[PDB]
Amino acid sequence: PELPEVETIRRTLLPLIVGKTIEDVRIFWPNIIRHPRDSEAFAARMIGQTVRGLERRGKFLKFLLDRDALISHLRMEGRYAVASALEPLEPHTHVVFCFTDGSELRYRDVRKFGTMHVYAKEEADRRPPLAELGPEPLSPAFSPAVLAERAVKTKRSVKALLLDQTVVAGFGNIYVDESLFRAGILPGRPAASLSSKEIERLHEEMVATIGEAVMKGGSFQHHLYVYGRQGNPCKRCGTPIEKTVVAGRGTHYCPRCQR
């Protein structure tokens, strides 16, 4: 889940939990709990608090309670669902929040990579993992200048720069590949080699790509140009789409539209 999917989860989940009061917290896989370290303390402190809201920062979900904020990162496969506490749980359910009205918020995660941090609302933004995140892509804080400032000061590929949550937050493998294609830039090239003209266009395609994705509720998979299409013809020039590895990850691109 990248920014578009997490934003979709946020909008759907909020009306289902706002106003509900936590009666119990059950944890079946302790390692997901990062702070406080003791999973027993994590559970005890939330009991009695009511859900006041749900926000998003980068790829993180921020559950706003009475005094605390629960910061959740879904990583690769984490997922949330609301259901009746009288029914049996689905496989791979690792954390459950039971509400006083008989309902519950279930957290599933097959690979167990997700993390959960709890801090007082006022400390959240100044403590890890939210402290060092870059600006939100769909806000005035993200501008060509910001990208250029970070770009012209590193030898790594442009794709590595965009995957760095401290440069800009919310972009993942799918939308980095799609944005680079639309801007017409090869992923594996030095970020320092990009021109003012290139950086500006990229900034523009990034904003437009992530914006459209949210409106379509995320993967919008019918609107992908390169991700997952290795071997198939380019939708604009017809050249077969290629796949290699860059920044330690699968990377898709068109050798003709991208330079």
Next chain:
DNA sequence: GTAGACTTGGAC
């Protein structure tokens, strides 16, 4: 920077 880990299931 391209790995090395954490950890489970589906494709071929």
Next chain:
DNA sequence: GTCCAGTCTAC
């Protein structure tokens, strides 16, 4: 059976 799918930490 072997290859593929967002951070942290490390040769």
